[PDB]
Design a binder for these strands. Structure first.
Length: 256
DNA sequence: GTCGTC
DNA sequence: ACGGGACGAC
């Protein structure tokens, strides 16, 4: 874990919530005929509400969510993941997605992305960017679009809240993030010709020919990511392994 | 709680 | 065919 110490700012664990400082706040273009839609918030049980509350509060403290009055409104859903009885906020942005202008999907499919890994580079590092979408600011003009209602019995919010960052459930988030990070890591690729860097939204794979080149490469990548404002999961990081898990594949001896 | 789909 | 009903997707 000497890496955790050498790169404080790069790990989600010690660098705090990220923010892509080099990326201009995103403006989300609407379809030519779109008009705001305000969907009714169906009553939520106290159990769900209590489970969600801490997440909402944390996001408010972090500034990711802010109060607002908007012509738009979509449902907030209480979702117990892994069948487990733990609730987390899930916004139904389907009506918003329908009204936002489409963009060409530029994220490669994992199968094709992996085809770009030579047998020569067998030293790997896998990094997962934490709260990736949240690292990208949303332009003030586009924020109203993702509003939802938030109710709390004692001293909280009085109406709607919305995101100041690219949100979950928005049809174009994966693509916009992949493109933004590609722009931010363009220079790194240029400064490290001998390194292979695969990008799949927030799932990164760095490939080197030698253990040391992977150590040096990994150090530089972590340094760059931290400086750019992104955060990698230290808990999940797979640093300089000749065998790693990436996008559902088990990379070993140049296999898969 | 909806809602598109195999 | 044509449509009630499981999956999972937001």
């Amino acid at each position: 874990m000497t890496w955790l110490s050498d790169f404080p700012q790069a790990w989600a664990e010690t660098g705090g919530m990220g923010l892509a400082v080099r990326q201009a706040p995103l403006i989300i273009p609407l379809k030519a005929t779109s008009t705001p839609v305000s969907i009714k918030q169906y009553p939520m049980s106290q159990e769900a509400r209590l489970g969600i509350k801490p997440h909402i509060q944390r996001l408010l403290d972090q500034g990711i969510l802010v109060p607002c009055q908007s012509p738009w409104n979509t449902p907030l859903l209480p979702v117990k993941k892994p069948g487990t009885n733990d609730y987390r906020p899930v916004q139904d942005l389907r009506e918003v997605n329908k009204r936002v202008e489409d963009i060409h999907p530029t994220v490669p499919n994992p199968y094709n992305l992996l085809s770009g890994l030579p047998p020569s580079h067998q030293w790997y590092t896998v990094l997962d960017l934490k709260d990736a979408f949240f690292c990208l600011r949303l332009h003030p003009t586009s924020q109203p679009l993702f509003a939802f209602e938030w109710r709390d019995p004692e001293m909280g919010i009085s109406g709607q809240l919305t995101w100041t960052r690219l949100p979950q459930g928005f049809k174009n988030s994966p693509t916009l993030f992949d493109e933004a990070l590609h722009r931010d890591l363009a220079d790194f690729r240029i400064q490290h010709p001998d390194l292979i860097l695969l990008q799949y939204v927030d799932d990164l794979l760095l490939a080197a020919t030698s253990e040391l080149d992977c150590q040096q490469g990994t150090r530089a990548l972590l340094q760059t990511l931290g400086n750019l404002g992104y955060r990698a999961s230290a808990k999940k990081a797979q640093i300089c392994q000749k065998q790693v898990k990436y996008l559902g594949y088990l990379l070993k001896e140049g296999q898969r």
